[PDB]
Amino acid sequence: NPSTTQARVVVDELIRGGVRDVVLCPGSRNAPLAFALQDADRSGRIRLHVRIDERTAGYLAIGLAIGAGAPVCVAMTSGTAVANLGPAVVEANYARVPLIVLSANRPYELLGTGANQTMEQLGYFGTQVRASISLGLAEDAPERTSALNATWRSATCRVLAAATGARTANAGPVHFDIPLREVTPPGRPAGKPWTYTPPVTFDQPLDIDLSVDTVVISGHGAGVHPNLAALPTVAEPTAPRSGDNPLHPLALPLLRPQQVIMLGRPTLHRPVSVLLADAEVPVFALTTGPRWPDVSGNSQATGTRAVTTGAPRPAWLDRCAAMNRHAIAAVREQLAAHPLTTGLHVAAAVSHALRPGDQLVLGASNPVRDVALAGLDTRGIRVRSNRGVAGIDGTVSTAIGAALAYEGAHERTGDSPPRTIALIGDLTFVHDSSGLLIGPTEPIPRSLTIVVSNDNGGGIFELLEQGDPRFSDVSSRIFGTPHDVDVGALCRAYHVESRQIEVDELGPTLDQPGAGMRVLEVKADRSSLRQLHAAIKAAL
Amino acid sequence: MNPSTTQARVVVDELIRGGVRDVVLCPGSRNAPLAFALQDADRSGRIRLHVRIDERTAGYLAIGLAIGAGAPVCVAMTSGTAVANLGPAVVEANYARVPLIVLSANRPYELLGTGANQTMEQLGYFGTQVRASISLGLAEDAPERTSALNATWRSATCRVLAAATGARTANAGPVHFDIPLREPLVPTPPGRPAGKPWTYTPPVTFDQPLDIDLSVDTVVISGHGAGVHPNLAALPTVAEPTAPRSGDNPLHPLALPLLRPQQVIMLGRPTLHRPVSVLLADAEVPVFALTTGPRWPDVSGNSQATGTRAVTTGAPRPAWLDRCAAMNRHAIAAVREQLAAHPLTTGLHVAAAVSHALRPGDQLVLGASNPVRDVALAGLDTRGIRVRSNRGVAGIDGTVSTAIGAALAYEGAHERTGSPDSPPRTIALIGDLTFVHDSSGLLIGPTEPIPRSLTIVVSNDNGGGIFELLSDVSSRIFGTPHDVDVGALCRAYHVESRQIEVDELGPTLDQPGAGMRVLEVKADRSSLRQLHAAIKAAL
Amino acid sequence: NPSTTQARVVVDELIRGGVRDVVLCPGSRNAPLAFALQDADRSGRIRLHVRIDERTAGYLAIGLAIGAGAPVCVAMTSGTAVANLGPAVVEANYARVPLIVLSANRPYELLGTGANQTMEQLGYFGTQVRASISLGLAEDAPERTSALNATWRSATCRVLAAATGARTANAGPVHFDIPLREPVTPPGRPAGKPWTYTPPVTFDQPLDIDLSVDTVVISGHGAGVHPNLAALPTVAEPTAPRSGDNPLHPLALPLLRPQQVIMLGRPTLHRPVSVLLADAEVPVFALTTGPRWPDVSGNSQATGTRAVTTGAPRPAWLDRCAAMNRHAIAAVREQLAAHPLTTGLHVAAAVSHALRPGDQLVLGASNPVRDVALAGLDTRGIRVRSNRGVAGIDGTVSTAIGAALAYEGAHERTGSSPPRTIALIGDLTFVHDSSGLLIGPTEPIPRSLTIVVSNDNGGGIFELLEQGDPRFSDVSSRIFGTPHDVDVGALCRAYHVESRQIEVDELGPTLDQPGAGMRVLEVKADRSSLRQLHAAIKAAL
Amino acid sequence: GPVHFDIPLREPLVPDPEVTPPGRPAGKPWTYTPPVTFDQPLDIDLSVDTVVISGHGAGVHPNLAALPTVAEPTAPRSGDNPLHPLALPLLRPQQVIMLGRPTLHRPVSVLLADAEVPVFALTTGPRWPDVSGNSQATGTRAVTTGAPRPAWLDRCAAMNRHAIAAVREQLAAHPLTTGLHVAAAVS
Ligand SMILES: Cc1ncc(C[n+]2csc(CCOP(=O)(O)OP(=O)(O)O)c2C)c(N)n1
Ligand SMILES: Cc1ncc(C[n+]2csc(CCOP(=O)(O)OP(=O)(O)O)c2C)c(N)n1
Ligand SMILES: Cc1ncc(C[n+]2csc(CCOP(=O)(O)OP(=O)(O)O)c2C)c(N)n1
Ligand SMILES: [Mn+2]
Ligand SMILES: [Mn+2]
Ligand SMILES: [Mn+2]
């Protein structure tokens, strides 16, 4: 059989290319490269992860990818695989995550006369993936074994480079097909990839004068800019910080910046949106990759670097620092004044408990905002959130995958693995609750703690226009969506340790390692959420 | 003004700020707002407009206007099959990395599925072929929103321009810019101060250094899109005609099989030569791929590495250089002796004569099939001349229009330098089937710009010459000479044309003549196999 | 060889399905089913047409399909094949013509690492085709020849049914891929029957309509025939089949107030028609075949396939409509007589008057198809074609040639001199597809095709519209008139096509004479006066 | 089938403090399209020994009620002559009438996979299943000729009894409750 050789060559090149983890789902036909993948899994060269739910599996792959920054494969086998992987692939595209989807088409069967129970295709692969590469059918030619080895490894390297953005700096999902009919040719010496791609730079310098009153907004994907380290910075949680001059999100409406340097892709805070769209404020977008964020079209220039002249006026820095202290104290004070535990209270407790070396996975909705409003100093901590499309789906498996990948990185350097802490809301937890179902044969994280802040619904709609009390009569059912799930019972069903705790007990519980993967539920209230935010700004 | 008019004038203004000097317009009622705005911009001298009937050849006219001087070019056409006709040029623009903006009018998107006349699935029609598919919002009559609408329209236009020119990706290519338009179609918020683009995105520097040891016996193969590598100038280089040459040590393509290079540096995208293609399919020979953008060719399965430039240790063996230099002379001398010994005139004879007539400063446009390869076999020295050829997919469509657009843009850049000299020559070499196939590219309205110094040389062996160099029942049409009268075609489109024999070619190219003219040279293809077999036996 | 057997089975089942003509273009690689198609063309079982121009080749196939209603294959095999065939496929989709696009993937070759020699893909296949079917590679086991023969013929019948709308009544293009690896026939059903037999189908959606209400019928492209609507005043587009003998001239519509409208097929002509179909005071009843119904304004009251009528039209309404019909015919005829210069409307009137039953008329887009409607041609007994799906001016010469060849082939089967096919196109339309005149001596050539070119050196239709207002006079000339000065005669001579420039009163006698070949008649026409001619017609209504 | 109705929306997204544009009189649809009647008659001769396999989405056929029928649970049964799935591989029908979209049984798939038995596909809509390489024809209903042979009905009835008895006897003798036991209980 020529295909097993091909399959083992591909897997070998994938491993040479930094793939440590592969996610599989069972289905009616054999997974692509399965024997080669189980060969490699037994020998320890690669770590397989099996799940029954295809959708949580794709998000597990995303977590495995963003946990340490490596490409990961997902190889699946059903008439529902393409449909269930859809959400993860859209997130991989928009968040620029290197996710390799493996398929195994069959050139000897008919296509288009009915239902294919591999790869039932939808319409999103055209728009979402960086590349779509299929090897040829492996054929009978001992005579051609050297050339076919050269072709298979080159194409695999082409798949890896497209997914990681090695030459484009635009990482994203790739569709990789290894067709099937139904002593392995060596790669390069010393484990070198067949086609080596040396490091790449994309350089677009923009002139910027810092004497103009300047604020920095940094969002998802933002780079690190040392020449902007001292500027007042409104940094989203997932944005790596350059310096030590934070500007709280709620101080922005009280300031009038003359120009904005926006790093990466922002998605949080309406005052950020209004400032970005203000026609009188020049906006400089510094990002990596082909496109730039600009919902209003108001931006003046895009590039990758700033070349700076001048320095900010001290009165501008002084007043920015003053409003920053004004806003932080307003939140602390009204949190102390507010009686009922809310998700904002939980976020502050989680932030205080964090320490350098931690990984923090944040859910969408109020959790990722609340951490920003709690004012977490994110330096030394690696913050992950699925900001590409900001869905409330797949966050449990994302956190599981990130902790596994981050812990795997801790092993290969030869103490106990670093903590990974996830803060998610109750709806988000319910959405991806099947991520908790992990078989005994599958890898399980050692230091994953998932904090669920449960206000029995979506607290975020209490802060929006539909949260207005003129909508008190109608907002609860179509926006609040209360559900009454028993989180403790759910975690017990999947044999995952869980606990109810109060916000003041959170730090002490998080300190101690705990028996592996655990859930801590904190009860929260969203009826007082609108007033609580009303009180915080009312103190500004 | 009504919304479609304002929006069309905003897009045209931002396109001009973004460096668009030439626009190809195809007639239609739906694109009246853009047609009117484009015409007014042409009358003011801000752009040069070019009206064409046939959208497919118009697309290749846009390509020629783009490759002639390296600017982004926009082609505008109405909804319906006029957009489907841009398909072939878009595929060429994709594979040749040509900044072609396809600006299509459209009906509102909610009219799809309603049986509206002349409406189709336009957005996404080109799929993977384009760098971006961007659509403007149907303009609405909100007089308060006009300032914000102006920002969004100019911003989307800057996104279109950056994707087309590869301003952030370093990978220029076609872009589809779709504007849904509503009635009335028949009749301006300002941009940035000082004529700057609305969103200023400077051209990126894309850098990928790569270590290569030159004491290893090394040959360079440079194809379409190759960059200039001064640290590789001394090396023996098998350079395609469209490849710009770093140095002065050419290596004839037929000399390659007579050599044993220890390693190969591949520049850009090689397309042309069977000895090249064989050598690159040799797993045993290491190939390093250097390119100007993120893409790199899959022609060799043993591409060891990728880069944009080389970091060189060492120098080539003087004996290696001496030997490669000898084999190069040996190869080109075989060609020239077998051409002299050949009784009949062939397209290879015509390409040799054309190469001899060129002078530095000329632009040379080569058609697919035998012309572009015949020029390489004839040993053309390309330094100082700009050589264009549609190497993306190497089809026969649009070659005449590509030669015309390239001449026009090459001449416009020359007026720009301020020289009072005659504009520089553009000389094209295309086969007879290619010329007949795109003969309607000769059509230019009386109002429309006409090249001032374009000579199209048609090498006419009355059929498909390269098929001697070897099937389907599809090949039966080639088994019979077509007998299409090239002269009659040229008068149909009121273009000066003359037959000449091959010795008149040099002297005839030296006299300027009409701004655009066609020189037909009769050739023989019945002896082509004999000639080529005599060349190989002489090596 | 497994591939070889597969190819002859597929070609044999296509023939059984009614495929008479296949269009091929030479390319980088060997066409789909090339050897099987080559054998069948020798036996006279199938007829091949080869062109170098891939765009004109798709429109040639459209013509061969609409000439007699037969499904047509295009086997095209290059890196620009999909791009050039796009216009033809879009037209086949919107006009519902059975166009089977044949391809041949190589599963043993890589995809997506660069340019594809076989099939460089665009984004339109996924939205324009009724189906995408791909055979398996022919596996090499002789125990299963009977099993593989059944699978291949079943799949080929599935391709044909999708293309002809045999079960859906929604004909259109389908993509048929027969994969291949470089480098006696299992028999089909007895008596030449298709492997999977699709007996006749009916989609029945009756709509209740009261004809006592003042009713007008607008029938367009794809319209059916309705005997219970034969008496109604009917504004019929030239491609629409007539159900009755009570026509209503398009220019007479704005002079009347129908209380309700029955719309047949897909209307694409006349602004008074679109205004009336959009009038919220007028209930519109759409009777079409197929899944969708035309309704740009969304004003339509109901859609179905058939009408169940009560009552009859008031005789006052009939005489009112008949009287406006007469005034409209009178206005066109007199103002044409009173106009000194020859326009395309003059040419369209002359072509109409020369037509006789049994003719095939092929109408180009723009003014020609409208002008024939303005001349009040009686389309009964006439087969009228026009590419109204997208109404492009591209590909019309090959569409006329293909339709002439298909219509002549059906006549050759009767055993009976071939019937006339007469084409009327504008000069821009001719210039667009002039390369379609290039037919090799190896290739089928019509015997009775006369292409009439009405040449006003530009697009005359833009004189009539928004851009034709004299206030726009300076700019509009260049961007809408698009004059070109092409010498049609020199162009035809270059392609060895008999051609002559004649005055319009010579048109009738010349068309009656047998030209015994494919030929091109050119009539010089003026468009500078087109706007005032039409204004004079309207004033005489 | 499913359709995708996408609605672009922008702020303000919530109602303003309170006039809805009306539809047609009398609650009628804006554009009224009655449900189509899709009809494709197909001649079948029932004296040839026939089995009926009914899949998901199968129609109801009175003129086929006498024929031995293997009907999936979702198939709306119309006949009075059931044939158990396990009796199919012990029968050799001369022709097969296939209703709707069969999906459930391997022997059904095996029988339909055989290229030697003619299959007639009777469906409710334009689609028809490709599970059989030897589908002679398609229809919506059958125009029957003849009647099933008495000897053929006896065999099918006889093998049907065996299959029912085998399942019933072997469930009764099995020591452990299985999912098949749960299914019979629910049934
Ligand atoms: C898949 C998906 N569905 C719906 C939404 C819209 N949405 C955004 S936030 C939110 C509420 C999330 O509630 P929860 O996770 O409990 O967080 P909380 O706001 O209560 O802290 C919803 C439904 C989404 N972002 N993704
Ligand atoms: C491999 C390949 N073969 C054929 C074609 C189509 N094609 C390309 S060149 C050609 C004939 C070229 O003839 P001509 O233009 O006279 O130039 P010559 O080769 O005779 O010099 C054809 C049919 C193609 N696109 N690709
Ligand atoms: C491919 C394509 N491009 C552009 C158009 C827009 N268009 C419609 S009519 C027309 C003018 C046609 O001129 P001609 O064929 O000479 O007919 P005339 O108006 O002179 O009667 C144009 C350009 C179209 N319908 N199809
Ligand atoms: Mn909640
Ligand atoms: Mn030639
Ligand atoms: Mn005209």
Coordinates of C-alpha atoms in Angstrom, one line a residue, chain B residues 467 471-472, chain C residues 25-31 54 76-80 106 116-119 182:
Chain B
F467 CA 2.5 21.9 -32.0
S471 CA -3.6 13.8 -29.6
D472 CA -7.1 15.1 -29.0
Chain C
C25 CA -11.8 23.6 -27.3
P26 CA -8.1 22.5 -27.7
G27 CA -6.3 23.0 -24.4
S28 CA -3.2 22.1 -22.3
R29 CA -4.6 18.6 -21.6
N30 CA -6.8 16.1 -23.3
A31 CA -10.5 16.9 -23.3
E54 CA -13.5 29.4 -25.4
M76 CA -13.2 22.3 -22.1
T77 CA -9.9 21.7 -20.7
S78 CA -7.5 24.6 -19.9
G79 CA -6.5 27.1 -17.2
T80 CA -8.7 29.8 -18.7
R106 CA -6.7 14.3 -11.8
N116 CA -4.0 24.4 -11.9
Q117 CA -3.4 23.3 -15.5
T118 CA -6.7 21.4 -15.6
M119 CA -9.3 23.7 -14.0
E182 CA -2.4 10.0 -16.9

